[PDB]
Enzyme design. Structure first.
Site, PDB file in Angstrom:
ATOM      1  N   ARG A 177      -7.668   9.026   3.696  1.00  0.00           N
ATOM      2  CA  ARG A 177      -7.379  10.409   4.135  1.00  0.00           C
ATOM      3  C   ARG A 177      -8.386  10.848   5.184  1.00  0.00           C
ATOM      4  O   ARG A 177      -9.093  11.867   5.085  1.00  0.00           O
ATOM      5  CB  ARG A 177      -7.310  11.335   2.935  1.00  0.00           C
ATOM      6  CG  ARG A 177      -6.158  11.047   1.997  1.00  0.00           C
ATOM      7  CD  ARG A 177      -6.211  11.931   0.787  1.00  0.00           C
ATOM      8  NE  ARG A 177      -7.532  11.858   0.132  1.00  0.00           N
ATOM      9  CZ  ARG A 177      -7.941  10.918  -0.690  1.00  0.00           C
ATOM     10  NH1 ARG A 177      -7.115   9.893  -0.993  1.00  0.00           N
ATOM     11  NH2 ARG A 177      -9.149  10.844  -1.214  1.00  0.00           N
ATOM     12  N   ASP A 242     -10.759   5.463  -5.061  1.00  0.00           N
ATOM     13  CA  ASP A 242      -9.703   6.277  -4.506  1.00  0.00           C
ATOM     14  C   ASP A 242      -8.384   6.318  -5.169  1.00  0.00           C
ATOM     15  O   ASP A 242      -7.391   6.475  -4.317  1.00  0.00           O
ATOM     16  CB  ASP A 242      -9.780   6.329  -2.966  1.00  0.00           C
ATOM     17  CG  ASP A 242      -9.157   7.575  -2.354  1.00  0.00           C
ATOM     18  OD1 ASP A 242      -9.371   8.674  -2.914  1.00  0.00           O
ATOM     19  OD2 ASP A 242      -8.319   7.470  -1.354  1.00  0.00           O
ATOM     20  N   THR A 243      -8.047   5.727  -6.265  1.00  0.00           N
ATOM     21  CA  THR A 243      -6.644   5.708  -6.779  1.00  0.00           C
ATOM     22  C   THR A 243      -6.399   6.542  -7.989  1.00  0.00           C
ATOM     23  O   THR A 243      -5.782   7.612  -7.974  1.00  0.00           O
ATOM     24  CB  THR A 243      -6.107   4.206  -6.911  1.00  0.00           C
ATOM     25  OG1 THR A 243      -7.035   3.596  -7.848  1.00  0.00           O
ATOM     26  CG2 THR A 243      -6.042   3.412  -5.659  1.00  0.00           C
ATOM     27  N   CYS A 348      -0.156  -4.627  -7.497  1.00  0.00           N
ATOM     28  CA  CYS A 348      -1.428  -4.211  -7.927  1.00  0.00           C
ATOM     29  C   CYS A 348      -1.982  -4.953  -9.104  1.00  0.00           C
ATOM     30  O   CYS A 348      -1.539  -4.774 -10.240  1.00  0.00           O
ATOM     31  CB  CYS A 348      -1.399  -2.745  -8.300  1.00  0.00           C
ATOM     32  SG  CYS A 348      -2.925  -2.000  -8.777  1.00  0.00           S
ATOM     33  N   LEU A 349      -3.143  -5.540  -8.842  1.00  0.00           N
ATOM     34  CA  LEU A 349      -3.926  -6.255  -9.886  1.00  0.00           C
ATOM     35  C   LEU A 349      -4.614  -5.231 -10.800  1.00  0.00           C
ATOM     36  O   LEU A 349      -4.885  -5.594 -11.916  1.00  0.00           O
ATOM     37  CB  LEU A 349      -4.984  -7.153  -9.183  1.00  0.00           C
ATOM     38  CG  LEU A 349      -4.504  -8.460  -8.541  1.00  0.00           C
ATOM     39  CD1 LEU A 349      -5.507  -8.999  -7.572  1.00  0.00           C
ATOM     40  CD2 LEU A 349      -4.377  -9.497  -9.671  1.00  0.00           C
ATOM     41  N   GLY A 350      -4.884  -4.054 -10.293  1.00  0.00           N
ATOM     42  CA  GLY A 350      -5.641  -3.056 -11.079  1.00  0.00           C
ATOM     43  C   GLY A 350      -4.772  -2.231 -11.955  1.00  0.00           C
ATOM     44  O   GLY A 350      -5.224  -1.269 -12.600  1.00  0.00           O
TER      45      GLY A 350
HETATM   46  C1  HEM Z   1      -2.836   4.854  -9.781  1.00  0.00           C
HETATM   47  C2  HEM Z   1      -3.598   3.840  -9.459  1.00  0.00           C
HETATM   48  C3  HEM Z   1      -3.259   2.776  -8.438  1.00  0.00           C
HETATM   49  C4  HEM Z   1      -2.181   2.703  -7.626  1.00  0.00           C
HETATM   50  C5  HEM Z   1      -1.045   3.729  -7.391  1.00  0.00           C
HETATM   51  C6  HEM Z   1      -2.342   1.537  -6.821  1.00  0.00           C
HETATM   52  C7  HEM Z   1      -1.443   1.135  -5.837  1.00  0.00           C
HETATM   53  C8  HEM Z   1      -1.488  -0.100  -5.225  1.00  0.00           C
HETATM   54  C9  HEM Z   1      -0.516  -0.523  -4.225  1.00  0.00           C
HETATM   55  C10 HEM Z   1       0.730   0.320  -3.936  1.00  0.00           C
HETATM   56  C11 HEM Z   1      -0.811  -1.777  -3.907  1.00  0.00           C
HETATM   57  C12 HEM Z   1      -0.088  -2.736  -2.966  1.00  0.00           C
HETATM   58  C13 HEM Z   1      -0.465  -2.556  -1.513  1.00  0.00           C
HETATM   59  C14 HEM Z   1       0.322  -3.368  -0.534  1.00  0.00           C
HETATM   60  O1  HEM Z   1       1.319  -4.054  -0.924  1.00  0.00           O
HETATM   61  O2  HEM Z   1      -0.211  -3.301   0.619  1.00  0.00           O
HETATM   62  C15 HEM Z   1      -2.099  -2.114  -4.551  1.00  0.00           C
HETATM   63  C16 HEM Z   1      -2.687  -3.324  -4.554  1.00  0.00           C
HETATM   64  C17 HEM Z   1      -3.909  -3.577  -5.123  1.00  0.00           C
HETATM   65  N1  HEM Z   1      -4.601  -2.750  -5.994  1.00  0.00           N
HETATM   66 FE1  HEM Z   1      -3.914  -1.085  -6.789  1.00  0.00          FE
HETATM   67  N2  HEM Z   1      -3.454   0.824  -7.209  1.00  0.00           N
HETATM   68  C18 HEM Z   1      -4.031   1.608  -8.225  1.00  0.00           C
HETATM   69  C19 HEM Z   1      -5.227   1.268  -8.813  1.00  0.00           C
HETATM   70  C20 HEM Z   1      -6.037   0.215  -8.536  1.00  0.00           C
HETATM   71  C21 HEM Z   1      -7.270  -0.144  -9.258  1.00  0.00           C
HETATM   72  C22 HEM Z   1      -7.916   0.688 -10.372  1.00  0.00           C
HETATM   73  C23 HEM Z   1      -7.786  -1.204  -8.590  1.00  0.00           C
HETATM   74  C24 HEM Z   1      -9.032  -2.039  -8.999  1.00  0.00           C
HETATM   75  C25 HEM Z   1     -10.238  -1.658  -8.509  1.00  0.00           C
HETATM   76  C26 HEM Z   1      -6.799  -1.651  -7.637  1.00  0.00           C
HETATM   77  C27 HEM Z   1      -6.860  -2.833  -6.958  1.00  0.00           C
HETATM   78  C28 HEM Z   1      -5.819  -3.364  -6.214  1.00  0.00           C
HETATM   79  C29 HEM Z   1      -5.831  -4.651  -5.599  1.00  0.00           C
HETATM   80  C30 HEM Z   1      -7.005  -5.658  -5.649  1.00  0.00           C
HETATM   81  C31 HEM Z   1      -4.691  -4.779  -4.908  1.00  0.00           C
HETATM   82  C32 HEM Z   1      -4.206  -5.947  -4.065  1.00  0.00           C
HETATM   83  C33 HEM Z   1      -3.718  -7.230  -4.723  1.00  0.00           C
HETATM   84  C34 HEM Z   1      -3.175  -8.240  -3.736  1.00  0.00           C
HETATM   85  O3  HEM Z   1      -3.110  -7.879  -2.524  1.00  0.00           O
HETATM   86  O4  HEM Z   1      -2.755  -9.339  -4.174  1.00  0.00           O
HETATM   87  N3  HEM Z   1      -5.752  -0.770  -7.634  1.00  0.00           N
HETATM   88  N4  HEM Z   1      -2.430  -1.050  -5.383  1.00  0.00           N
HETATM   89  C1  LIG Z   2      -2.798   0.895  -0.767  1.00  0.00           C
HETATM   90  C2  LIG Z   2      -4.006   0.651  -1.656  1.00  0.00           C
HETATM   91  C3  LIG Z   2      -3.681   1.806  -2.583  1.00  0.00           C
HETATM   92  C4  LIG Z   2      -4.207  -0.783  -2.259  1.00  0.00           C
HETATM   93  C5  LIG Z   2      -5.524  -0.656  -3.118  1.00  0.00           C
HETATM   94  C6  LIG Z   2      -6.397   0.307  -2.245  1.00  0.00           C
HETATM   95  C7  LIG Z   2      -5.486   0.630  -1.016  1.00  0.00           C
HETATM   96  C8  LIG Z   2      -5.942   1.826  -0.184  1.00  0.00           C
HETATM   97  C9  LIG Z   2      -5.325  -0.690  -0.138  1.00  0.00           C
HETATM   98  O1  LIG Z   2      -6.051  -1.016   0.798  1.00  0.00           O
HETATM   99  C10 LIG Z   2      -4.429  -1.653  -1.009  1.00  0.00           C
END
Ligand code: HEM
Ligand SMILES: CC1(C)[C@@H]2CC[C@@]1(C)C(=O)C2
Length: 405
Positions: A177, A242-243, A348-350
């Protein structure tokens, strides 16, 4: 600031949506985006804002584009282009098959097994934060709960000082943002200045933290590089900071306004996990994209190699073709369909850690603080971006109605 229409874009495909500052923001962020799904808007539009880019508006097209990495590459996932260009996070800026070995490592760090181990801390922090707030009869949910809760767990996980929060949080915010205060590259560099020393240190003298594991991991049978490590860690930070932070504020905002929703969860706790999916569907908040690797005809529109396309994860669950009465929150929908956590190889892994923090919060807040509302005369403001947010969330309650545990 509208960029001139590229030649291949049919003028009837023009719909000037600013992902950074959509028109209806006042109405709520999800409502601002949902304008894209009105009957007057084609399925695939071109906005002249933010340099010009495609936006897919329907769950169907988002999923397909997300599946198709061959045409829709992750190399330049952010808009505007300079930001997508400066974007070098692993695994996200890589496509399959390369992405795979990286995802496997990130998984080691954030996956199920970690959540299971960290369960009791999550619950302990939640209860502690809540109890401390309870007797006040008032907080600033965004600052008082939504920031600390998720971040302090991430800091714990990562083995980084709570002291760094304010600095890291600023930088992360800049990426999703953007203020105008700093460019993506600058922000990226700053985070990187932070991380570099630390990795060096954890390469030499490893710990049990996520940075120690990431820095010393194997990928494709060889050891990860410092650069590679820096680049995964960077993503871990943004993910962590940030999520969940922003998600919790939307959810809480809704709960503060819907007594009937709160009671349903109090009386029929078995519903929490269903409620969680429903809130993840309605308060979905992520919008990134992909870049065209080549000229391609997608659902009858010709995309040119190098075109960026926003594929708003947020939009799929709001699509009426996917969810009946999409803006309505219904904890008992037969089928909650969303792509909140993404779709395709980048899912998403998280996700597991996020669901755990949500469900804990819902259960533990409602337990102690059953009855709350938004403060009289507070005007809640949303924010839009790669990750949307809530500026502040002033809540009030009668302590006499609370229950100590
Ligand atoms: C409400 C909470 C969250 C939402 C809505 C969210 C959403 C997403 C989205 C939409 C993606 C895919 C992005 C793309 O395809 O470019 C992503 C990927 C990912 N998220 Fe989450 N995320 C959340 C929480 C978290 C948490 C807590 C972490 C861990 C610190 C995290 C780590 C990641 C990682 C490592 C990926 C990428 C995996 C890969 O590219 O194989 N996220 N997330
Ligand atoms: C779109 C996301 C929500 C996902 C985890 C953090 C984020 C900002 C990215 O760079 C991949």
């Amino acid at each position: 600031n509208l960029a001139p229409l590229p030649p291949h874009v049919p003028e009837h495909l023009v719909f000037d949506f600013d992902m950074y500052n959509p028109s209806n923001l006042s109405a709520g962020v999800q409502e601002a985006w949902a304008v894209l799904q009105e009957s007057n808007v084609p399925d695939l539009v071109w906005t002249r804002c933010n340099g010009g880019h495609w936006i897919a508006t329907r769950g169907q097209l988002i999923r397909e584009a997300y599946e198709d990495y061959r045409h829709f590459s992750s190399e330049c996932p952010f808009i505007p282009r300079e930001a997508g260009e400066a974007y070098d996070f692993i695994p996200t800026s890589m496509d399959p098959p390369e992405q795979r070995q990286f995802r496997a490592l990130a998984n080691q760090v954030v996956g199920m097994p970690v959540v299971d181990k960290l369960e009791n801390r999550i619950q302990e922090l939640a209860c502690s934060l809540i109890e401390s707030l309870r007797p006040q009869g008032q907080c600033n949910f965004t600052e008082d709960y939504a920031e600390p809760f998720p971040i302090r767990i991430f800091m714990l996980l990562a083995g980084l000082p709570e002291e760094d929060i304010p600095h890291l949080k600023y930088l992360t915010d800049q990426m999703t943002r953007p203020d105008g205060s700093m460019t993506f590259a600058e922000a990226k560099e700053a985070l990187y200045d932070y991380l570099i020393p630390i990795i060096e240190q954890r390469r030499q003298k490893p710990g049990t933290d996520a940075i120690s594991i990431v820095a010393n991991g194997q990928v494709n049978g060889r050891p990860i590089t410092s650069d590679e490590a820096k680049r995964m860690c960077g993503l871990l930070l943004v993910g962590g900071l940030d999520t969940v932070v922003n998600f919790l504020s939307f959810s809480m905002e809704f709960l503060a306004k819907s007594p009937e929703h709160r009671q349903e969860l109090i009386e029929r706790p078995e519903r929490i996990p269903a409620a969680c999916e429903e809130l993840l569907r309605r308060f979905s908040l992520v919008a990134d994209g992909r870049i065209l690797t080549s000229d391609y005809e997608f659902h009858g529109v010709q995309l040119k190699k190098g075109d960026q396309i926003l594929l708003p994860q947020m939009l799929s669950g709001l699509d009426e073709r996917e969810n009946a009465c999409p803006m309505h929150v219904d904890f008992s929908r037969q089928k909650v369909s969303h792509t909140t956590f993404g779709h395709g190889s980048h899912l998403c892994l998280g996700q597991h850690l996020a669901r755990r923090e949500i469900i804990v919060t819902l259960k533990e807040w409602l337990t102690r603080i059953p009855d709350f509302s938004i403060a009289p005369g507070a005007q809640i403001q949303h924010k839009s971006g790669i990750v949307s947010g809530v500026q502040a969330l002033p809540l009030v309650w009668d302590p006499a109605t609370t229950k100590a545990v």
